[PDB]
Design a binder for this molecule. Structure first.
Ligand SMILES: NC(=O)c1ccc[n+]([C@@H]2O[C@H](COP(=O)([O-])OP(=O)(O)OC[C@H]3O[C@@H](n4cnc5c(N)ncnc54)[C@H](O)[C@@H]3O)[C@@H](O)[C@H]2O)c1
Ligand SMILES: NC(=O)c1ccc[n+]([C@@H]2O[C@H](COP(=O)([O-])OP(=O)(O)OC[C@H]3O[C@@H](n4cnc5c(N)ncnc54)[C@H](O)[C@@H]3O)[C@@H](O)[C@H]2O)c1
Ligand SMILES: [K+]
Ligand SMILES: [K+]
Ligand SMILES: [K+]
Ligand SMILES: [K+]
Lengths: 494, 494
């Protein structure tokens, strides 16, 4: 199909980068440039935040009720469901993710807006919520207002979904925003610009700057009229954006991925659990923030599990994303390809065993394809064990004791997610409690519902997006307390 | 009487600074070194966090229930009420604040712990709160666990109260902590160490390092095993601590004070409001984070308000804090004294009018005493208008329009509090909504109840302490979602 030429979406209309630079979009499956995106620069950020600030000042969006903004949200969700086919295809060719996965993404963005429409609606009538004071002299309630203009910065692994994880709560709260999506996957996001016009979003309420991290994002976060930054990306980058935000004591939420464990005890149906473990580390082509990329399996089932494991993954149709039956596409880019490949090299070099994969597929001669990979004979000292690979690469180690599974699981600087498998539920509760982590899956891995709070701890960052926590990141919690006594304070003397 | 010659509180017992350095405590009223406090250094921070981390690992505090910790809280509150007299004294000589104010502080710390004892109790049964998912296949709830070891850093303007604003929620949540109080007011806080032993707090659950900001606090915030920082202080310092915390993507709450407006409309009994305006800017000797230090009064009552104003403040007994009837003490320190004085000089120099005070009192010949000060003929360009003075110094400007009051009030980079006076309540609501601020007082100024969320926006920082928000800053909000179907995910092929 025809990717589209598209431009910068600023103040409801399409604008050209002030420096007129652009960058390639590239099919991960063909290595071929299949198109073009604007390359926003600091000067574009300036006009964008200005539009956003102006839009915020209008008595047209921000001081509006939640129920009012919920209709635009509900409408956006509807529009997306309508142009479904169109989005899911664009997302498959831009991301390199299996077409079947992309269908889920797009259903999920629709569903996300609809959940936050609800949130915005519940925002009303949280307003002026009373707080009880001791005195009778004073009365007090809470207002929940938009913080103002917010910068949203998202990753390429679920282009539109990750972006709406930010857009939906931001808009629900009454903020205006500047979105800067990954330079590795901007098309659906740019295409979102039209959707806004089609649903009648006031101009400047959502602005979309595509471009490189350093050129477009950095200026977004350091801008003096952006009140809050919502960042999702690597921990290394997180640190950078938080330091920049610190200059202006600007609030920040950081979702930074990790090195999440999946611990499997003896008492499990090793055929399903095996299916998850594959899901937890290979799906989305291994590019999952919460990827359960470290398997801690009991020595008991150790061999067998791993056997069925290699069998199942051996079972995965690695092909071009559009090809029917495709359960695994190419990684996002040449750079990522190289990085993942190097992680593999230095893992051999460090003395681990590539008990499957670790190489290009075979049937695929072009495109950034990499075979689901299982590596064993692991030391907790090796790089592969500590570093997030963000490719289809799984590490295996075994354990004797329960609290050795525990110690071994918590043995990272990261702390995003974890998955524990066992039919002994009193054992499951005990493990979920002990995991130094923000999300614990019990007898599954990766299911992420918009109803539930989502974020990490430790190097994985802080703050919770989604659920009933999402909208809160974009609000000014305002206390108002008034004197109803009409008597003098009586502290001083007249 | 004699002060409290203490040492550092670490792991339940009194330890000496590893570098054995100490610093003077000084009565603001006598300029006289009346004592001595330990001067913690980075090496002390090391042993302190270690104690804290160990204490957190003990199945003795952190994995305990909220109701269990609530008793230590309730006990601490009791002990403080018991040793009331002793604390309020020590506070008065350490802070230079009027004895009557100190009295209040100490009642407030007691009350604060009790409120958070309640919070910790409510924490239970929020545990495993269910979140409803669409699919029947999955069940989900939320756990609320302590983040781990937290560093708490507080200011001198309410030595123990400001510290318990952090200690109480931290302990209620199940965290262990290292407290680093201001070097300008550490005695009560050091004395709190004993209270803990007396109520049986496990060792290492609360540690207290006194010392200088750069020597004791900086190492506390940059330490690799401190999971979260709660900071209250100047915006300039806030920026530094957040930049440091960014190194390790460490969560942070920042309460940074401001330049809060008090806007008074024509329709008010200008004797009651006048008393507040004095309270809002001169109480605590002008050293209030939320100090309503900018008066925007309607030209109508302008003259007369200001008249009764000068009259009232002219009526304020400025004397030694212990002297009965004392409504105004010395500022905290020589350095603060100098800073406040300079603000006055450069305000003269910039062309403002010192319509009262601006100088040392007469009857007081020693001690850091400064007259309640009223300054007029203000330009929004002058330093006195923008910069937080943190002394008993009030600026006055007048307004014609309502939305001129509004524009003029929002005319700062800060955004902590604001106070609006008017018997027209429809007008009040309108103004409270428009104020770019975190707390809006209606027909009063400064009343801060532990029941209500407290914090700022803009340069005043972010996050809310106290109320139902307080405890939240010290929790890991953990999602747990489990598969109850027993069926295969069914995404791949066996
Ligand atoms: N916890 C989560 O919610 C979550 C979800 C998915 C992915 N992730 C993480 O996302 C990462 C992959 O995404 P990525 O490669 O796009 O991450 P990244 O760190 O490169 O950056 C993500 C976004 O930040 C922008 N950016 C980069 N440098 C910037 C700078 N200096 N200033 C401002 N913005 C800048 C990027 O261009 C991109 O839009 C993985 O590490 C994964 O762990 C986290
Ligand atoms: N917003 C609020 O809730 C609130 C409440 C009270 C006071 N305040 C503000 O507090 C300020 C006055 O307090 P202050 O003089 O103590 O502020 P400050 O910034 O000088 O320092 C405050 C605390 O931080 C420590 N500190 C200093 N430098 C540090 C560093 N580099 N790293 C780590 N810690 C460091 C100090 O020792 C002190 O204990 C005012 O600006 C006032 O508005 C705000
Ligand atoms: K791409
Ligand atoms: K963290
Ligand atoms: K002192
Ligand atoms: K801010």
């Amino acid at each position: 199909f025809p990717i589209p030429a598209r431009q910068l979406f600023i103040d409801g209309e399409w604008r050209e980068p002030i420096k007129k630079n652009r960058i390639p979009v590239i099919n991960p499956s063909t290595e071929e440039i299949i198109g073009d995106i604007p390359a926003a620069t600091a000067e574009d950020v300036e006009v964008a935040v200005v539009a956003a600030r102006r839009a915020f000042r209008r008595n047209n969006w921000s001081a509006t009720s939640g129920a009012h903004r919920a209709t635009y949200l509900r409408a956006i969700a509807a529009k997306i469901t309508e142009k479904k086919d169109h989005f899911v295809k664009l997302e498959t060719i831009d991301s390199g993710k299996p077409f079947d996965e992309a269908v889920l993404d797009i259903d999920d963005v629709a569903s996300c807006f609809e959940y936050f429409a609800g949130q915005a609606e519940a925002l009303d009538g949280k307003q002026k919520a009373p707080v009880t004071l001791p005195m009778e002299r004073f009365k007090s309630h809470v207002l929940r207002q938009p913080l103002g203009v917010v910068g949203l910065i998202s990753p390429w692994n679920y282009p539109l979904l990750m972006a709406t994880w930010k857009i939906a709560p931001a808009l629900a709260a009454g903020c205006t925003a500047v979105l800067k999506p990954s330079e590795l996957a901007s098309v659906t996001c740019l295409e979102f610009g039209e959707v806004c016009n089609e649903v009648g979003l006031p101009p400047g309420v959502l602005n979309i700057l595509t471009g490189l991290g350093p050129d477009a994002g950095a200026p977004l976060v350091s801008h003096p009229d952006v009140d809050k930054i919502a960042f999702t990306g690597s921990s290394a980058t997180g640190s950078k954006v938080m330091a920049s935000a610190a200059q202006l004591v600007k609030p920040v939420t950081l979702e930074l991925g990790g090195k999440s464990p999946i611990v499997v005890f003896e008492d499990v149906d090793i055929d399903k659990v095996v299916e998850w473990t594959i899901f937890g580390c290979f799906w989305t082509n291994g590019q999952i923030c919460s990827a359960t990329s470290r398997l801690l399996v009991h020595e008991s089932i150790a061999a067998e599990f791993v056997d069925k494991l290699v069998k199942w993954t051996k079972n995965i149709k690695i092909s071009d994303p559009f090809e029917e039956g495709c359960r695994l596409g190419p990684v996002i880019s040449k750079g990522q390809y190289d990085k993942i490949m190097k992680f593999i090299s230095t893992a051999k070099s460090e003395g681990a065993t590539i008990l499957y994969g670790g190489s290009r597929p075979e049937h695929l001669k072009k495109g950034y394809y990499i075979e689901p990979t299982i590596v064993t004979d692991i030391s907790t000292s090796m790089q592969i064990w500590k570093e997030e690979v963000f490719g289809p690469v799984l590490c295996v180690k075994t354990f004797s004791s329960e609290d050795e599974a525990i110690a071994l699981a918590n043995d990272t600087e990261y702390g995003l997610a974890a998955a524990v498998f066992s039919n002994d539920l009193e054992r499951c509760e005990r493990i979920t409690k002990a995991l130094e982590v923000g999300a614990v899956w019990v007898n599954c891995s990766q299911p992420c519902f918009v109803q539930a709070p989502w974020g990490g701890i430790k190097r994985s960052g802080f703050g919770r997006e989604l659920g009933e926590w999402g909208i809160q990141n974009y609000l000014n919690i305002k206390q108002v307390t008034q004197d109803i006594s009409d008597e003098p304070w009586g502290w001083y003397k007249s």
